[PDB]
């Protein structure tokens, strides 16, 4: 079927002066955290997945107030995930199936994704996403300040190539059973130049030559056991130094670190807060699964509630952000 | 950003012949038979870790073809013709990506040579197998491939499971690099279903594709932190496959983590499989073997017929290993 | 530079159910006139060129009332021509929508499709001249009648194009009056052709067309005017000799009025007289009309042409009443 | 149906150093003629249409010997016409239907046309053709030293735009009834820059901005009456100067100047030969319909015989060229 190329969506929704400026600078600001030049804490926070742009915009307006408030301690960027990797099968996100009913209206979904990202950046909220597909990025990577490569794809050569050509910093998650070396290796690969086949903005396949991405880091997201504590952070930091790549890392409070219990994301954040207080020198960022309303639901019946992984609600979100900001204020004072 | 010819340009210059088309169609059907337990021959995916020299490849194929015919009642021999290689971090990604082996990345030439070699192989009677790594290169030559692999590093990847769901050949999913078998079992489940995703057409344009699912996927045991080739591991995998409601017939890789990356250990693994086939071995439908004209590996392509990637057994050792497997499977089939 | 393909525009501006029905119906009604099943007179009327969407909609709202009023005698369809072909030298609303040498073709094609959809949606069907081989895919779905101009009637590329169009097509005689080239064009366009074209996705392809059975000639003058009974009778003779339809359209403007735009009325009266006497070979007329009569080099006066001079609204009422009255009498025989 | 783009053909049949040099040199030589820097006579000579590459190459090998023999007096370039305009319907040429059987194998036809042109340039014979289609030129214009726009398309805006973007000199024929102003007007238009839609080497439609073609001229090819004589040449020269364009022009010995009778081309050439002897300062070239065997045939039964317009045969061709060379040697001595 008949896919509109990126240029069609770029013509309807060109990046504005403000969005372009916000993306450019947030990427720069994140590079400084990745390389230990600034000691603010990157916070990637928001829904497991976007299934309703309206709830997403409401969420973003609340989050914007806290982004501003804590701007000296925390660098807040919203989770805006449009592509979801499933264990076997299931809804792959808003792009793949925006009407949430098996109609796979991908043109509508890409348009909605771009429109949401443009609106977010226009309001002052930078955005992040996981890059899962090789073709979808040309539709909206210009509006992304930070990207993730998921646990299920960190070891994949086509995803490392993708990352090597992205203009934003990229986090690589450790593997689903806890393997960190694949992520360390991914930084090596993505940091170098690659030649590979991709698709242009006009929608045609082409040979691209990337320059490499100097702003990649790892993300600790648990395995058979959680890997967020000081002992794990120290082990990982030594392995990063050994490989000659940045030893500054991100810690995901959710997924296999909370072991799929949204109420434990706060516990993880408190452990991180104590590391920042005691030392915490290898930590540059945290990831949190958060929505307007806590929990999850199989069907999109309740507004502002996840249909994928369970999230903390808005009030726990305010608490969690206050805790990290206070803890990092103390770290930054040393 | 450089000037890629679309699949239709290569297809025009190198159209599939009646003979190649018959060989592919038959070989896929025969392999399907093995996957679903209808025939008890052993699929043998055998040849170089990587193809870097089409002359040496054609010579290899010539020698192998005699053995394919000789052992045809006990073994279904298909050549490894791997054109895309995953690197640990960085390095030469294969003949397609850089066919002149010097960082000129002449991909139009690479794709052309890959198709030419596959067409020449099928025309001489040797079916071909490859690892599908890239999302766009398959359209250039998948019509000439009888069996496909998704590698250990990409079995968990949703975009690779999608690709597999639209392939017309049977597909083997390798267990993960540390030993995880569940990802490959999950992959069979995923690739067996219909998917909708973005891909590139034969004309070189991006499009929405809707696949029908691939009913002929299976797992490949290739070792992890510890090897997983033995009877206990096979029995344990078979139980997991049945619990997930997918085929309990599997393939065993003698190389990579099952040989502890020591090419001289491939024969020990094959000897263990032979022993399983003689005793029972009902869940084994195939084996994988990294093999070339000359054993070992080299950083540079100085020696003819010697791998520049993973180390391989040599030709003599290939005769030994194939004879061992054909003997042992003859007995399995007899009962 | 970076051309959006037709599918980008078709996505933002899908044809409505109402527009689709109007185009479908009007094409058929026109075909009925081309082949003598109905004796209403097609009238292709409106500006020489469209340079202002706002004025074009205002003109359409006025024309719509007369379209309905005269519907038993006349089939009124608006002229929505975006440009000229030049002898040489403003390059039309598509090729240059900002009227300033910036050639913003993406914007121009978008604006063209937008206007055509709005026109169809209000009940006014639209006609245009197809000048190039690529632009038609962006809006031919909104066109009820197409023209091939005098300067391109003889061209094999344009005959091919016409053979694949889903609307009826009029071929103008040559710039110096040559009628044979238009007669030959109908014959060429009625057949199947294989040739290279561009798809709605923006890619070159081989297309195989089925032929267009609803083509006709248009008399637009030359070395001398060719609107009178004598010239109409000779054309009809030549048409029947070539085995194609002997129903034709008369352009009141261009080389039939020459240097006086007000002569369109005289041509129209001569046509009225033919209709009253007999006039059996006339299926249509073309008229260059706008809100305000005349022309201007620069777009200062609202609703006045910036290409060829046009009769104004009051004279348009006059000319349509005249034609409707005359054709009423022809249909009553 | 499934059209290979130009790049597919360019990859299989890249232009050689030799062909590239011959085309560059020949284009420059022809420009010098159009602008009166040189008084050699351009001679565009060969079949009405190509229906058989084998005969065309045999024809070229004979013509090369004369090309070389007359090089100080004549600039001989072969007619290699692959696209034919029909009065109503009929075979449109080798590209459109190479197997001459209603199969329209256009991929094969383009491949065969490019192959022939490359072979011709490689043997030392430059080539000319009529550019009828908007899309086919990308496949082989790099191998063409001179182009024609036909009588039936000279008045066409799209053909004038096409001409404005070509790298070769272009001749515009007067209209089919004898109108010369359309060709004079065409030179005007094709000398300007244009913006229009075209198709790329990769097979995608795009906006192209051409720089104008400063090497255009008119071709006198007859109308109701012929227009080859001194008086018509003299009339056309005055109008060229009046429009401010080159008053050097080309005369077609065939088509409407021969009343469609192949035995009259020699009479036209003889008239031209007298003008060249008397004065003939405004003539820069001639066009002649020539083949191995004279006349025409309905089916491709006889080898080297036209299936379109009737042509003079090889013997008459030698006579005609000797005549023009002898006459122009004298013009050039003054
Ligand atoms: Mn999640
Ligand atoms: Mn290997
Ligand atoms: Mn006009
Ligand atoms: Mn001819």
> Rounded distance, CA D85 to CA D129, Å?
13
| Residue C89 burial (10 A CB sphere; 0-12, 13-18, 19+) | exposed
How many CB atoms lie under 10 A from the CB of residue A58? 15
Q: Which ligand is nearest to the CA of C287?
A: 3
Instruction: Count the alpha carbons within 13 Å of D116 in the hemisphere toward its beta carbon.
Output: 30
> Rounded distance, CA B80 to CA A295, Å?
49
| Residue C17 burial (10 A CB sphere; 0-12, 13-18, 19+) | exposed
Q: How far is the CA of B291 from the centre of ligand 2 (A)?
A: 10
Give CA angle at D331 (D327, D332), nearest 5°.
115
Size of interface C-D (CB pairs under 8 A): 124
For residue C299, which phi and psi values (nearest 5 degrees)?
Answer: -80, 65
Asked if D37 contacts B34 with a C-beta cutoff of 8 angstroms, the reply is: no
Reference D138, options D201, D208, D204, D207; nearest CA is: D201
Q: How far is the CA of D83 from the centre of ligand 4 (A)?
A: 11
- Crossing angle of helices B107-124 and B54-70, in 10° steps, is 20
Question: What sign does the CA torsion over A150, A151, A154, A158 have?
Answer: negative
Asked if B82 contacts B51 with a C-beta cutoff of 8 angstroms, the reply is: yes
Domains of chain D with bracketed CATH: 1-334 (3.20.20.70)
Closest CB to D205 among C3, C131, C154: C3
D67 is in an annotated binding site: no
A79 is in an annotated binding site: yes
Widest pairwise Cα distance in chain C: 58
Asked if A203 contacts B207 with a C-beta cutoff of 8 angstroms, the reply is: no
> Rounded distance, CA B164 to CA B179, Å?
21
Within 8 A by CB and 6+ apart from B147, the residues are B27, B28, B31, B43, B45, B78, B127, B129, B169, B170, B171, B172
> Rounded distance, CA B110 to CA B95, Å?
6
In Å, how far are A129, A288, C81, C317, D142 from A35, measured between CA atoms? 21, 22, 61, 77, 52
Structure tokens at D66: 């004369």
Bridge partners, residue B307, by sequence = B297
User: How far away is chain B from the Cα of C105, in angstroms, using its nearest Cα?
Assistant: 23
D151 is in an annotated binding site: yes
User: How far away is chain C from the Cα of A326, in angstroms, using its nearest Cα?
Assistant: 49
Contacts of C187 in chain D (CB under 8 A): 88-89
Interchain pair C11, A8: CB under 8 A: yes
For residue A55, which phi and psi values (nearest 5 degrees)?
Answer: -60, -40
Within 8 A by CB and 6+ apart from A122, the residues are A16, A18, A19
Q: How far is the CA of D171 from the centre of ligand 1 (A)?
A: 68
C151 is in an annotated binding site: yes
> Rounded distance, CA D94 to CA C202, Å?
26
**Beta strands, E only, C175-219:** 194-198, 204-208, 215-219
Residue showing tokens 């899908």: C14
User: How far away is chain D from the Cα of C159, in angstroms, using its nearest Cα?
Assistant: 9
User: How far away is chain A from the Cα of B120, in angstroms, using its nearest Cα?
Assistant: 25
Q: Is D207 within 8 Å of chain A by CB? A: no
User: How far away is chain B from the Cα of C203, in angstroms, using its nearest Cα?
Assistant: 9
Q: Which ligand is nearest to the CA of C288?
A: 3
What's the helix, strand, coil split of chain C in %, to 5? 40, 20, 40
Reference D147, options D77, D73, D242, D50; nearest CA is: D77
For residue B252, which phi and psi values (nearest 5 degrees)?
Answer: -120, 120
Structure tokens at C310: 């046009």
How many CB atoms lie under 10 A from the CB of residue B316? 11
Closest CB to B158 among A132, A182, A189: A132
CB-based neighbours (< 5 A) of ligand 3, an ion: C 48, 308
How many CB atoms lie under 10 A from the CB of residue A71? 12
> Rounded distance, CA B233 to CA B284, Å?
12
Structure tokens at C155: 């061209």
Q: Is A5 within 8 Å of chain C by CB? A: yes
Contacts of A8 in chain C (CB under 8 A): 4-5, 7-8, 11
D173 is in an annotated binding site: yes
Contacts of B205 in chain C (CB under 8 A): 201, 203
Contacts of D159 in chain C (CB under 8 A): 155
Q: What DSSP assignment string belongs to D238-307?
A: HHHHHHTS---EEEESSGGGTTT-GGGHHHHHHHHHHHHHH--TTEEEEEEEB-SSSBB-SSS-STT-BS
> Rounded distance, CA D204 to CA A202, Å?
9
> Rounded distance, CA D22 to CA D145, Å?
8
Q: Which ligand is nearest to the CA of A148?
A: 1
Q: Is A204 within 8 Å of chain D by CB? A: yes
D55 is in an annotated binding site: no
């Amino acid at each position: 079927k008949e896919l509109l190329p990126p240029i069609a969506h770029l013509y309807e929704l060109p990046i504005s002066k403000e969005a372009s400026g916000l993306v450019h600078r947030t990427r720069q600001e994140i590079s400084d955290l990745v390389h230990g030049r600034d000691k603010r804490l990157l916070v990637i926070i928001g829904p497991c997945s976007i299934h309703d742009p309206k709830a997403a915009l409401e969420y973003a307006e609340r989050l914007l107030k806290l982004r501003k408030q804590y701007e000296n301690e925390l660098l807040i960027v919203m989770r805006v995930y449009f592509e979801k990797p499933r264990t076997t099968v299931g809804w792959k996100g808003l792009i793949n199936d925006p009407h949430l009913d098996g109609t796979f209206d991908i043109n509508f979904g890409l348009r909605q994704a771009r429109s949401l990202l443009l609106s977010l950046n226009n309001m002052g909220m930078p955005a992040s996403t996981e890059f899962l597909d090789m073709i979808t990025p040309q539709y909206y990577a210009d509006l992304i300040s930070w990207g993730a490569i998921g646990a299920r794809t960190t070891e994949s050569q086509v995803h490392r190539q993708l990352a090597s050509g992205l203009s934003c910093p990229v986090g690589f998650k450790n593997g689903t059973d806890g393997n960190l070396k694949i992520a360390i290796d991914a930084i090596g690969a993505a940091s170098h130049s690659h030649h590979f086949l991709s698709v242009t903005k006009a929608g045609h396949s082409a040979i691209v030559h990337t320059g490499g991405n100097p702003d990649c880091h790892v993300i600790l997201r648990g395995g058979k056991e959680p890997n967020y504590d000081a002992e794990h952070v120290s082990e990982a930091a030594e392995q990063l130094r050994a490989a000659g790549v940045t030893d500054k890392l991100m810690i995901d409070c959710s997924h296999a670190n909370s072991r799929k219990d949204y109420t434990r994301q706060m516990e993880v954040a408190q452990d991180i807060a104590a590391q920042l207080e005691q030392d915490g020198g290898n930590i540059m960022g945290v990831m949190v699964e958060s929505h307007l309303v806590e929990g999850r639901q199989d069907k999109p019946e309740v507004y502002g509630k996840s249909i994928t992984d369970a999230c903390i609600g808005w009030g726990a979100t305010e608490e969690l952000l206050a805790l990290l900001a206070g803890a990092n204020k103390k770290r930054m004072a040393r």
